[PDB]
Amino acid sequence: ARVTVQDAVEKIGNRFDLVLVAARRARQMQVGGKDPLVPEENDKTTVIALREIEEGLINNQILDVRERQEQQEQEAAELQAVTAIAEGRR
Amino acid sequence: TEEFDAIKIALASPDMIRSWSFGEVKKPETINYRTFKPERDGLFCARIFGPVKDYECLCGKYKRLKHRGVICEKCGVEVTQTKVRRERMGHIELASPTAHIWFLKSLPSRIGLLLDMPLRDIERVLYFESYVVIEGGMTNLERQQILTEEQYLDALEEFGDEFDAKMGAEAIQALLKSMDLEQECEQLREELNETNSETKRKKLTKRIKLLEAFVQSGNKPEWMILTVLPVLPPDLRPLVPLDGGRFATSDLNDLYRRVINRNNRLKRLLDLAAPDIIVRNEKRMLQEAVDALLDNGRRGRAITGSNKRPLKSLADMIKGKQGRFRQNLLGKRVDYSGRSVITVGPYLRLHQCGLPKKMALELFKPFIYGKLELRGLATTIKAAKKMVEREEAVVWDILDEVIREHPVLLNRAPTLHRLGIQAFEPVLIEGKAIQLHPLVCAAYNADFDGDQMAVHVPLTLEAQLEARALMMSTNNILSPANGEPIIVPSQDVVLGLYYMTRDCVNAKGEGMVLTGPKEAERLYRSGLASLHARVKVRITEYEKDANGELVAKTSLKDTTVGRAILWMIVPKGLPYSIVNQALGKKAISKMLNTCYRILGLKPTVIFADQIMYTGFAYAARSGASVGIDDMVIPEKKHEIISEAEAEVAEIQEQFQSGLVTAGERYNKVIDIWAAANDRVSKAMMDNLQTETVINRDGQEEKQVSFNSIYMMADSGARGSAAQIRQLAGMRGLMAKPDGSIIETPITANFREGLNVLQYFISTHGARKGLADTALKTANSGYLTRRLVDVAQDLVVTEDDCGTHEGIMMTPVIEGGDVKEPLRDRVLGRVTAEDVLKPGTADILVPRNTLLHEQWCDLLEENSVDAVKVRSVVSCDTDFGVCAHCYGRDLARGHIINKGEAIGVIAAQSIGEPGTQLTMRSSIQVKNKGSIKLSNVKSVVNSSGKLVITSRNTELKLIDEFGRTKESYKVPYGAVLAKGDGEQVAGGETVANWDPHTMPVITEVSGFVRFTDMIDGQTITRQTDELTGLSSLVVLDSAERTAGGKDLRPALKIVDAQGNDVLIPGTDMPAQYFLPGKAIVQLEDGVQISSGDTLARIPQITGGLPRVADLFEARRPKEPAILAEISGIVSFGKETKGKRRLVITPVDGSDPYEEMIPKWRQLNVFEGERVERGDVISDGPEAPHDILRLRGVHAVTRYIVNEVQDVYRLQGVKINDKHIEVIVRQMLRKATIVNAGSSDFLEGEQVEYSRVKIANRELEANGKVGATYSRDLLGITKASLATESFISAASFQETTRVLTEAAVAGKRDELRGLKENVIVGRLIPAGTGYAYHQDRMRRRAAG
Amino acid sequence: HARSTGSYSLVTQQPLGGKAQFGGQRFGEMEVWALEAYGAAYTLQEMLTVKSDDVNGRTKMYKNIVDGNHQMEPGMPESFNVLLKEIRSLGINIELEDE
RNA sequence: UCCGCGGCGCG
DNA sequence: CTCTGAATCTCTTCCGACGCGCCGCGAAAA
Ligand SMILES: [Mg+2]
Ligand SMILES: [Zn+2]
Ligand SMILES: [Zn+2]
Incomplete structure (x- = not known):
């Protein structure tokens, strides 16, 4: 349960960037089928998206670095697949 | 997707408007009735506006999607979606070119200003009552004169085809085709340089700005006349089907059919080459028909239908509350909404609201479908609809699942303030009424009188996050109007708390000592000790250390067992001393605020919930109730009334004996009745407040009475002193609707029986109050709407602006008391400078620091008097304000965050109290202190007293700490009994004056010799009737003779031998003019002393209209005249009906002259020197005068002072910032005196931001900047002056805004919030702001 | 009542008004300013674009909600096109x- | 059936 | 004694919360 979010606001500072970053995290949670970084206790995606902010393990910076490592790892996997295909063709 | 940058508006050229059309329409028919199909060439033609059904040809030849984009060969109708019926517009060609109504008639007539013609002759021309002439050859008569018929004839016989004259409609465009605007603009420019008249320059300036706008914008003026008229697509004007195949006609269709009829008739009439009379009448009829089509009703009687209704035009569909803008664009009706009546839910928590099960099902049906598909129970949406209709038991479980954390927005109509919409996390209840948490009922301004409210549900994850973060009732517990908490317990809870904490001197189980509150609970719940018993108990309390650690302490202290019970629910950080009192609403408010300021938000929320529960519980157990025996009537009442009866009887007899007048008797009767009322009220309160009780020893004691009504009123739970006074004592001396007191008192109380005449008198005030309350809402709403629409643009963008100008602040003192302390007025502001310790140069508070509570405590300790703080009125940020100038954010305690729309918040915070408003000789020092005199030039008379020789002199009372507490105005020539800096006590007189006489004074001693003393030309000899004393009466300028009109009677100070006496410090001899109608008792050549006098000169608004006028900057009906330039005052040559006031500057070269109506009593003497902006006469001062004389800071101090005064009289608290921000938006525009190196023109009005940044870049280039003045535009005018034309069009005055924007080709950058909300993209504020900061970064990069 | x-009204594609015709509530300008003050711009945009006017957007949104995805799809309100x-x-x- | 206008009350 | 400019008077325009609920009823057009 979450009765108020003021602690998370303190963690992020401005409420608006808080809500934006939490929205991005929850959106990648719902459609990406990602993993919740905190035990969910059968809570909805939105509130656990706030809770991970409450822990402080995630913010805009960590969100950005995670998304960037994911995308360049996908790029590297694609490059490895292309290299394997070329080796098979050669 | 389209991501269009901006919106451009321009005139519709005939060629391009032809391109817009998919074709023309020939017949005035709509559909067939045999088959409901459009006619071959009607207003619904399938060839023209598209198919009647999606992807189906008109003749049915092709009926498959593969035929997309195919125009049927058999019938010629394109096969596509029916959506194009909304897109494709028709057009009509007119047999005669016809002008637009707007540009013709909207004042000022744009075509009229384009030409030099007056509007009247051109309009009578365009309706074909006169010709217009294009010159060729050498007649006496030139071009562009108006020529009637027989003059046209005699000119035709005299001159033939040498010259051209024409009837209106085509002649207007023909002439419009016959000018070059460049030669026109240059010739008018050189005329402007040539001319001297101000009105002439006004006319030519407006003309030149208009035509240069045409030139720059590239639109051709000849386009103003229409040769082609576009027809709106049929889908926007549907022909509504009715029962039996009948139809209801949309209004546009009738007007369009009329125009088609007239046009076709004119075409066939011209084809037959009929004489000119027929064609001219037909074409003028077509002109009026198209006039009605465009803007029906603007000119003449609007065309009407069989229903005698005035038919709607295109123009009427945009303008007005019912128009497209207000009705549709803003306030679109929404899906997923419900509405229901409210019900108190006591068992709820603070943030969860009870929702009817059926409403929850309907609102969340999309989610029920989604989860049912998720669990696979429903294979198809049809199945989902079945089971959701079949209310299978699984559906309810799913419903509980989906709403587990999904908040809903909840609104009560009408929203008055931002606390009017709150989000709750719902729970399901049976029934058909929304359960609401009791606390927020105060915030919603609900009263549970069958009032309805609505519910919406957010859909996106984003919106849910905004709801849970922003709108959740757990947050925003502090109102934005003022920091006071909004969730305040009241009524039953207050009653329960007060009854719980109250003590009784004798009670069961008193005296026993008890270990702790747990055992107190045990004792009372066992019924072994009453709630009011006073006992000694052990308690423990905790406090934050320097590190915030809760250090503990404990001890034994006296406590009522009820208060001991209360101590359970207190949070761990509260000190005990707060609870130790007779709790009331004010105390409880201080309590909750205390725990909010000390502990975190969660402790306060939990504490509020628990106090709610406990208050209700112990109020329930109280059983406090009102009985008929409670309103005890004092026995003294009969006696007091008897005494008053005698007093009035004897007074009436004294009036009948002729000893006193009717008005005097009226006044003293009112006085004695008021005294009687005071006596009886005091006696009744005394009897009620105290009760006789028995102690442990049986001895008589006294205690605060437990009478039900007394405790109800004392606690503040829905009551006050006035009502209890009316319950059992006198009802008072209220007035008639005219305001006159009826002079016959309302005797009995409500427990007694009010007699028929008594009650019928009592009803007048009730009816007046009810009517006023009912009628005020309209004006309050309107004022709010205007304020919001003025302030909608502002949003905090920059963190700081590098500026150091600011606003001086000092506590407001009126009538000898401080109306608002400096603590309040400066709390939450940002320091404008380095605050200095009093008497020292040491820095007390550094610059640019927030004034939170500790800093204000430090300032109070140092007893600082005045301080300078930054204000939004001084902000330098362009197109916005910085955070620091707006200072602290009220609702969150910390500094404001970027992206908060302060303007709308402030507008609503002004508006909300708007409901509460109501629209229908000597000076005593009150306290011990030191006398201070300011703005004074004073002398000491021969009597040893003090006389003032200056205006606007002010008398202050200042403490030893240097803080003023009393302030009064000093009348000119008054007698002052104390020196400067002298100490005085309260209730002490210090100065005296005659209120109804304007005296004169003489600082020097000497023989007064009278000059210009002539009977009938300057003065007259008179003898006082009552005393026989000789006197001279100065005659008026017209009372005297014509020859003596300009003669100036005056006193001259000389020595005993007549040698001139000079003014001290100057070489000028002392001469005092004699004003008209003045009287003097002394005679010529009489010695007087220093500081000596000889002269005999003779001496409301409702609240809501007052604030409306102040914000609108109404010119008062009686304005005070203020001096323009500092110099010696004089009267010029006498004028007719007015006096010629002249100022000769002390060092300026140009004297100044003003006409002032003769009836005005000028405050300043003629023989006086004034400073810039001196007050010449009494009366309210128009704010524009303040702005142009005393600068912006004076205006922004004045407006806030007055508005805060009105609200303070009403008692509603509101922070000065909200007034300041509005005023800042009021000063938008500015005019230019000298353009310097800018491209602007002198006398033009532009944006203050635009001229400021122009000066900035000009001096950055080293070039000459613009010299400007700032003009005070009223809220309506300032709203119409916004750069974005869309916002102005949405506001009001739509026709003029649209016309001006179209004529000028303005480009709207959709900057403001209202325009963006119109467009539908995210507004640039709050959560959206970051997105726009993500956009403007990259669009500039792209 | 619950809608x-x-x-939908034919002229402007807005939902009807009135319980008798099963119409939704009206989110008047007062509520617009109420949201404006709090911020919550996303909620306001959702209100105006999907739940009220944009036919394409509201259709896509309906499909998304049925699918369990809760992503906004903004679009030009048809009322503005009408204007x-x-x-x-x-x-x-x-x-x-700048089209 | 979905359109428009007038009157009445509620908050 | 006449002409022009400045100022007032006269006319015209705009506009007075909002949310519902209820009720009834369209046509010389077909
Ligand atoms: Mg009410
Ligand atoms: Zn066909
Ligand atoms: Zn600033």
Whole structure:
């Protein structure tokens, strides 16, 4: 349960960037089928998206670095697949 | 997707408007009735506006999607979606070119200003009552004169085809085709340089700005006349089907059919080459028909239908509350909404609201479908609809699942303030009424009188996050109007708390000592000790250390067992001393605020919930109730009334004996009745407040009475002193609707029986109050709407602006008391400078620091008097304000965050109290202190007293700490009994004056010799009737003779031998003019002393209209005249009906002259020197005068002072910032005196931001900047002056805004919030702001 | 009364008003300013674009909700297009810029 | 059936 | 004694919360 979010606001500072970053995290949670970084206790995606902010393990910076490592790892996997295909063709 | 940058508006050229059309329409028919199909060439033609059904040809030849984009060969109708019926517009060609109504008639007539013609002759021309002439050859008569018929004839016989004259409609465009605007603009420019008249320059300036706008914008003026008229697509004007195949006609269709009829008739009439009379009448009829089509009703009687209704035009569909803008664009009706009546839910928590099960099902049906598909129970949406209709038991479980954390927005109509919409996390209840948490009922301004409210549900994850973060009732517990908490317990809870904490001197189980509150609970719940018993108990309390650690302490202290019970629910950080009192609403408010300021938000929320529960519980157990025996009537009442009866009887007899007048008797009767009322009220309160009780020893004691009504009123739970006074004592001396007191008192109380005449008198005030309350809402709403629409643009963008100008602040003192302390007025502001310790140069508070509570405590300790703080009125940020100038954010305690729309918040915070408003000789020092005199030039008379020789002199009372507490105005020539800096006590007189006489004074001693003393030309000899004393009466300028009109009677100070006496410090001899109608008792050549006098000169608004006028900057009906330039005052040559006031500057070269109506009593003497902006006469001062004389800071101090005064009289608290921000938006525009190196023109009005940044870049280039003045535009005018034309069009005055924007080709950058909300993209504020900061970064990069 | 999804007015594609015709509530300008003050711009945009006017957007949104995805799909309100056409009928050129 | 206008009350 | 400018008077325009609920009823057009 979450009765108020003021602690998370303190963690992020401005409420608006808080809500934006939490929205991005929850959106990648719902459609990406990602993993919740905190035990969910059968809570909805939105509130656990706030809770991970409450822990402080995630913010805009960590969100950005995670998304960037994911995308360049996908790029590297694609490059490895292309290299394997070329080796098979050669 | 389209991501269009901006919106451009321009005139519709005939060629391009032809391109817009998919074709023309020939017949005035709509559909067939045999088959409901459009006619071959009607207003619904399938060839023209598209198919009647999606992807189906008109003749049915092709009926498959593969035929997309195919125009049927058999019938010629394109096969596509029916959506194009909304897109494709028709057009009509007119047999005669016809002008637009707007540009013709909207004042000022744009075509009229384009030409030099007056509007009247051109309009009578365009309706074909006169010709217009294009010159060729050498007649006496030139071009562009108006020529009637027989003059046209005699000119035709005299001159033939040498010259051209024409009837209106085509002649207007023909002439419009016959000018070059460049030669026109240059010739008018050189005329402007040539001319001297101000009105002439006004006319030519407006003309030149208009035509240069045409030139720059590239639109051709000849386009103003229409040769082609576009027809709106049929889908926007549907022909509504009715029962039996009948139809209801949309209004546009009738007007369009009329125009088609007239046009076709004119075409066939011209084809037959009929004489000119027929064609001219037909074409003028077509002109009026198209006039009605465009803007029906603007000119003449609007065309009407069989229903005698005035038919709607295109123009009427945009303008007005019912128009497209207000009705549709803003306030679109929404899906997923419900509405229901409210019900108190006591068992709820603070943030969860009870929702009817059926409403929850309907609102969340999309989610029920989604989860049912998720669990696979429903294979198809049809199945989902079945089971959701079949209310299978699984559906309810799913419903509980989906709403587990999904908040809903909840609104009560009408929203008055931002606390009017709150989000709750719902729970399901049976029934058909929304359960609401009791606390927020105060915030919603609900009263549970069958009032309805609505519910919406957010859909996106984003919106849910905004709801849970922003709108959740757990947050925003502090109102934005003022920091006071909004969730305040009241009524039953207050009653329960007060009854719980109250003590009784004798009670069961008193005296026993008890270990702790747990055992107190045990004792009372066992019924072994009453709630009011006073006992000694052990308690423990905790406090934050320097590190915030809760250090503990404990001890034994006296406590009522009820208060001991209360101590359970207190949070761990509260000190005990707060609870130790007779709790009331004010105390409880201080309590909750205390725990909010000390502990975190969660402790306060939990504490509020628990106090709610406990208050209700112990109020329930109280059983406090009102009985008929409670309103005890004092026995003294009969006696007091008897005494008053005698007093009035004897007074009436004294009036009948002729000893006193009717008005005097009226006044003293009112006085004695008021005294009687005071006596009886005091006696009744005394009897009620105290009760006789028995102690442990049986001895008589006294205690605060437990009478039900007394405790109800004392606690503040829905009551006050006035009502209890009316319950059992006198009802008072209220007035008639005219305001006159009826002079016959309302005797009995409500427990007694009010007699028929008594009650019928009592009803007048009730009816007046009810009517006023009912009628005020309209004006309050309107004022709010205007304020919001003025302030909608502002949003905090920059963190700081590098500026150091600011606003001086000092506590407001009126009538000898401080109306608002400096603590309040400066709390939450940002320091404008380095605050200095009093008497020292040491820095007390550094610059640019927030004034939170500790800093204000430090300032109070140092007893600082005045301080300078930054204000939004001084902000330098362009197109916005910085955070620091707006200072602290009220609702969150910390500094404001970027992206908060302060303007709308402030507008609503002004508006909300708007409901509460109501629209229908000597000076005593009150306290011990030191006398201070300011703005004074004073002398000491021969009597040893003090006389003032200056205006606007002010008398202050200042403490030893240097803080003023009393302030009064000093009348000119008054007698002052104390020196400067002298100490005085309260209730002490210090100065005296005659209120109804304007005296004169003489600082020097000497023989007064009278000059210009002539009977009938300057003065007259008179003898006082009552005393026989000789006197001279100065005659008026017209009372005297014509020859003596300009003669100036005056006193001259000389020595005993007549040698001139000079003014001290100057070489000028002392001469005092004699004003008209003045009287003097002394005679010529009489010695007087220093500081000596000889002269005999003779001496409301409702609240809501007052604030409306102040914000609108109404010119008062009686304005005070203020001096323009500092110099010696004089009267010029006498004028007719007015006096010629002249100022000769002390060092300026140009004297100044003003006409002032003769009836005005000028405050300043003629023989006086004034400073810039001196007050010449009494009366309210128009704010524009303040702005142009005393600068912006004076205006922004004045407006806030007055508005805060009105609200303070009403008692509603509101922070000065909200007034300041509005005023800042009021000063938008500015005019230019000298353009310097800018491209602007002198006398033009532009944006203050635009001229400021122009000066900035000009001096950055080293070039000459613009010299400007700032003009005070009223809220309506300032709203119409916004750069974005869309916002102005949405506001009001739509026709003029649209016309001006179209004529000028303005480009709207959709900057403001209202325009963006119109467009539908995210507004640039709050959560959206970051997105726009993500956009403007990259669009500039792209 | 509770509306959710239902009939739409033909002229402006907005939902009907009135319980008798199963119409939704009205989110008047007062509520617009109420949201404006709090911020919550996303909620306001959702209100205006999907739940009220944009037919394409509200259809896509309905499909998304049925699918469990809760992503916004903004779009130009049809009422604004109506206004554009109406002004274009007046004999005034109004158009979008930087298209 | 979905359109428009007038009157009445509620908050 | 006449002409022009400045100022007032006269006319015209705009506009007074909002949310519902209820009720009834369209046509010389077909
Ligand atoms: Mg009410
Ligand atoms: Zn066909
Ligand atoms: Zn600033």
